Design a protein around this ligand. Structure first.
Ligand SMILES: [Mg+2]
Ligand SMILES: [Mg+2]
Ligand SMILES: [Mg+2]
Ligand SMILES: [Mg+2]
Ligand SMILES: [Mg+2]
Ligand SMILES: [Mg+2]
Ligand SMILES: [Mg+2]
Ligand SMILES: [Mg+2]
Ligand SMILES: [Mg+2]
Ligand SMILES: [Mg+2]
Ligand SMILES: [Mg+2]
Ligand SMILES: [Mg+2]
Ligand SMILES: [Mg+2]
Ligand SMILES: [Mg+2]
Ligand SMILES: [Mg+2]
Ligand SMILES: [Mg+2]
Ligand SMILES: [Mg+2]
Ligand SMILES: [Mg+2]
Ligand SMILES: [Mg+2]
Ligand SMILES: [Mg+2]
Ligand SMILES: [Mg+2]
Ligand SMILES: [Mg+2]
Ligand SMILES: [Mg+2]
Ligand SMILES: [Mg+2]
Ligand SMILES: [Mg+2]
Ligand SMILES: [Mg+2]
Ligand SMILES: [Mg+2]
Ligand SMILES: [Mg+2]
Ligand SMILES: [Mg+2]
Ligand SMILES: [Mg+2]
Ligand SMILES: [Mg+2]
Ligand SMILES: [Mg+2]
Ligand SMILES: [Mg+2]
Ligand SMILES: [Mg+2]
Ligand SMILES: [Mg+2]
Ligand SMILES: [Mg+2]
Ligand SMILES: [Mg+2]
Ligand SMILES: [Mg+2]
Ligand SMILES: [Mg+2]
Ligand SMILES: [Mg+2]
Ligand SMILES: [Mg+2]
Ligand SMILES: [Mg+2]
Ligand SMILES: [Mg+2]
Ligand SMILES: [Mg+2]
Ligand SMILES: [Mg+2]
Ligand SMILES: [Mg+2]
Ligand SMILES: [Mg+2]
Lengths: 93, 46, 271
RNA sequence: AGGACCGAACCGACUAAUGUUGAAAAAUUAGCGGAUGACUUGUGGCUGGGGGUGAAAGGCCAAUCAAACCGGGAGAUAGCU
RNA sequence: GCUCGCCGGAAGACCAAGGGUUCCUGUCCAACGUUAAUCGGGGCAGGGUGAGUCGACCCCUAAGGCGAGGCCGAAAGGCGUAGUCGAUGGGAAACAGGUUAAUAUUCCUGUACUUGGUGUUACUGCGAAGGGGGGACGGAGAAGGCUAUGUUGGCCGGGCGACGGUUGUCCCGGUUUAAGCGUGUAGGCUGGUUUUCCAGGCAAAUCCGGAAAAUCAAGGCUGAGGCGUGAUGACGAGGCACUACGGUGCUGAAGCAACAAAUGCCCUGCUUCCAGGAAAAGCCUCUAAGCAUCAGGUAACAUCAAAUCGUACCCCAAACCGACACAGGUGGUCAGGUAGAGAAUACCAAGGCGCUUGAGAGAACUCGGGUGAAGGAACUAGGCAAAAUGGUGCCGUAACUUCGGGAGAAGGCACGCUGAUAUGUAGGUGAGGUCCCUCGCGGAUGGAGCUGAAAUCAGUCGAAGAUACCAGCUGGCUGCAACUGUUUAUUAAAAACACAGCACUGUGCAAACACGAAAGUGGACGUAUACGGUGUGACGCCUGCCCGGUGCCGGAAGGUUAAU
């Protein structure tokens, strides 16, 4: 499920928002941006080694990047992958 | 009333798609001409 | 039995139908069925090559034994069935060794009767053997044109062939067309007539009925415009053509047989 | 039982008014015909231009088809305006 | 915020297709919005789409596509074998509740299920690209059992009324609970078990098929719903606290019965007909090559795994197709109350809306409606348009007829409400009780309660009882086409096309014919009771004469006659 070079590249950033803050208070779940091609297993291992906490389950979705016009031309933001990573009850960080 | 364009992505891609152009000598010439013209979109794609 | 319908509606008044209570109700013998793909009369170019074909009921194909060469092993008729693929009926026969087959149902044949094929089978309706061993004068059906190739002649309901002569390695047959034809005597034939002669007494009674059978409308040439058919248009009803095919060939009277390769088996043409 | 009867959905399109720089490049309202059948409809497939398809009207083949559309021969030719 | 009005088999809700951020929140208003705009599907920023069991992918095939070699073709290419793709069809498994500003069968709570790997343990013949089974199949119709759902009663909470009455036979509301698990019911199909033998199932078979004995009468398979459990729970009017007045918290009564009842389910059934109604895999079983103390198979418990992509929002439309925030077009699903045959229609519920210029005025004329003295087709090409008819039941109904029809011919009578028969009837449903029982979801008996049309008699209100919406005008002579159908999408629906029926004519199967320089294919897995072409056009009574012309069929002697 892992090789350390890959695990280090798989988690990109914390994602911040009311939904993500609540998901932590209410459900001990942390919300992340992960590599696009990341799999739930990679995400789980990665979180477990690097942030050194135990993982219950990982859920993931893919966000479509918004388009923005510009007179006659469009620009397009990038799709990315969101990960809802639930920590085990004995909460950490 | 009912108009002539009734969409279907599946049928769009099967008639006009990249792979359909590539399947015949003449469709591959459609792509050649388009590339020579320097078109941004060779075919309607994803 | 052929039965007239009462005129409880105009499309029923003229219906006359062939109803045969000897025929199995419900489903055929599954192991002898194949798929049957409708064509609309179009060929492998997608073009209509034979007109007027289309729609009509779905049909499974029954595997009929035209060769009848399970020699020596007797068999009994279990039941007669309806076959949508042909005007004749068929019999489900059971061989002594457990095998089942379908055969064309000859006239008179019925559940219980015993059939058999081979160079020595009894001369009896439903039995098959090379015509060199069927007495001249007899009446046969499902006749082979080449040895072991399978029956091709006189299969349609009510049809039959008569062996009028045998000489050398060939028999001479009076086909149902009236034609006198030579076929080599090792060809197989089945004693009897094909069953269901009352077939030709049906009256469809309405247009829908021909549609159920996959026959689409014929449009008369004279009812078209010149560009479409040599039979042209006119101005009111007009004709004045010599009558032709849509393709400009003389319909009515022009012979179109042209096969020097087989001329020599034809003793006398139909009249 | 029935290409049966009356009648919504569904399919059609006989009459009239309106509209005609329209609400609409063919409709709306009131009525009308078929409605278990040769019915109707979704998805996908096949047939290609002197060619298709046509229960046949020269109908239909992407809003003008007695020969589609696009590109080319191409600045066709025009004793005409 | 209070009222008013509109839709309500939709103008509500939910899918698919198609779109693609239009979704939620903040902020802004130039342009877009047919007006203003603080508002918006507009600008800007930020947020938002969470799955083993919902879909895709995946396994399987249909039409059809592609196609190693191959057949064919000046080249390009056409066709096609093995194969390989291709859903609109087949194939494992999840439900109720709670939650966000915005997702949820995806998060949470509760309760489940499926198929694989690994281990342990007991038992064991395992093995496929093959055999066999199964999957697996039409139309119509009948009607019994059910559920969804509703109605009333009961139960529980609350109410005592802005104006006469309202502690009662009164008013309002609620009375909801899934998958899974257990039970095997109404009902559907079918005899069961053993042994022996065999020209079939490409070899093999313990399986299928066939044959022969023996033996028991009950065996097995399928199966809605109910009941139980799930549920010690969830949901639940309301209550009590707080509140930034948007909310949040805690708590929480009854939660039953009878009757009615689908177009949903039993039902892939049953009955019946002719037009005779996919494939392949998953699945069950059989063996072959093999493997034999291994492997593998079956089971229980344990343990691991179930990736990836979609998931926001619009969806009969302001977000899709229509250049528009366009009266058009767009497949599927759901089906509450009263009246009603109804999915028609009217009024309502849930839910959604008043259609993005308004204010006045109350001329002609135009559009769309209502009423109309006397007359009543005098209008006009023409009753064009209007007006009229319009339900149910019973009585009654001509010529003609192919005996079905014509026929709803025509015409007539009844029709509300109240009481009696009967404080609710015929019928439908069915409890307690009693008794039997191969004891159950059983049978008999019993008739309580519930529900309930229709008739007659008597009475009674109005001008009017099928009172609204809804809902045939009828009859006589005659041309044409038998009929139902089809057609000029967009000025013609007809007498035109088709049609069953009839005739002529070709066609012996490598058929004629047709698409193709060909290969290949349709005809047809058909075979003269068949297939093609042509004309006629139900049926009835019938279909006469002409072969000179033109067309076609047959002929061999003579003349003429090509390349050579
Ligand atoms: Mg996901
Ligand atoms: Mg014409
Ligand atoms: Mg000629
Ligand atoms: Mg009808
Ligand atoms: Mg209309
Ligand atoms: Mg009707
Ligand atoms: Mg299509
Ligand atoms: Mg030139
Ligand atoms: Mg010029
Ligand atoms: Mg935008
Ligand atoms: Mg918004
Ligand atoms: Mg403005
Ligand atoms: Mg916006
Ligand atoms: Mg989860
Ligand atoms: Mg090919
Ligand atoms: Mg090749
Ligand atoms: Mg495949
Ligand atoms: Mg599919
Ligand atoms: Mg939402
Ligand atoms: Mg194991
Ligand atoms: Mg099989
Ligand atoms: Mg059946
Ligand atoms: Mg119920
Ligand atoms: Mg008072
Ligand atoms: Mg039973
Ligand atoms: Mg509460
Ligand atoms: Mg949604
Ligand atoms: Mg919707
Ligand atoms: Mg519609
Ligand atoms: Mg508007
Ligand atoms: Mg619109
Ligand atoms: Mg309505
Ligand atoms: Mg008057
Ligand atoms: Mg008057
Ligand atoms: Mg009068
Ligand atoms: Mg006059
Ligand atoms: Mg006058
Ligand atoms: Mg009129
Ligand atoms: Mg009127
Ligand atoms: Mg009275
Ligand atoms: Mg006249
Ligand atoms: Mg007619
Ligand atoms: Mg027209
Ligand atoms: Mg018209
Ligand atoms: Mg005619
Ligand atoms: Mg004559
Ligand atoms: Mg001649």
């Amino acid at each position: 499920m892992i090789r350390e070079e890959r695990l280090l590249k798989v988690l990109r950033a914390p994602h911040v928002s009311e939904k993500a803050s609540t998901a932590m208070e209410k459900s001990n779940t942390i919300v992340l941006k992960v590599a696009k091609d990341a799999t739930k297993a990679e995400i789980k291992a990665a979180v477990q080694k690097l942030f050194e906490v135990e993982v219950e389950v990982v859920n993931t979705l893919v966000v479509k990047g918004k388009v923005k016009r510009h007179g006659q031309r469009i620009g397009r933001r990038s799709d990315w992958k969101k990960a809802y990573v639930t920590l085990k009850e004995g909460q950490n960080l | 009333m009912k108009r002539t364009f009734q969409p279907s992505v599946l049928k769009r891609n099967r008639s006009h798609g990249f792979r359909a152009r590539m399947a015949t000598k003449n469709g591959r010439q459609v792509l050649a001409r388009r590339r020579a013209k320097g078109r941004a979109r060779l075919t309607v794609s994803k | 039995a052929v039965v007239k319908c009462k005129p409880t509606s105009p499309g029923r008044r003229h219906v006359v139908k062939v109803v045969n209570p000897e025929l199995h109700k419900g489903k055929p013998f599954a192991p002898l069925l194949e798929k049957n793909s409708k064509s609309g009369g179009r060929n492998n170019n997608g073009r209509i090559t034979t007109r007027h074909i289309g729609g009509g009921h779905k049909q499974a194909y029954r595997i009929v034994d035209f060769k009848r060469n399970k020699d020596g092993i007797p068999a009994v008729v279990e039941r007669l069935e309806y076959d949508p693929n042909r005007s004749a009926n068929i019999a489900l026969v059971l061989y002594k060794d457990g095998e089942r087959r379908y055969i064309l149902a000859p006239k008179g044949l019925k559940a219980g009767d015993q059939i058999q094929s081979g160079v020595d089978a009894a001369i009896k309706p439903g039995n098959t053997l090379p015509m060199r061993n069927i007495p001249v004068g007899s009446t046969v059906h499902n006749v082979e044109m080449k040895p072991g190739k399978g029956g091709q002649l006189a299969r349609s309901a009510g049809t039959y062939v008569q062996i009028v002569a045998r000489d050398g390695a060939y028999v001479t047959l009076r086909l149902r067309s009236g034609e006198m034809r030579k076929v080599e005597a090792d060809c197989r034939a089945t004693l009897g007539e094909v069953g269901n002669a009352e077939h030709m007494l049906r009256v469809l009674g309405k247009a829908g009925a021909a549609r159920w059978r996959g026959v689409r409308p014929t449009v008369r040439g004279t009812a078209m415009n010149p560009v479409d058919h040599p039979h042209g248009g006119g101005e009111g009803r007009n004709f004045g053509k010599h009558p032709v095919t849509p393709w400009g060939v003389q319909t009515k009277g022009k012979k179109t047989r042209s096969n020097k390769r087989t001329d020599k088996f034809i003793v006398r043409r139909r009249s």
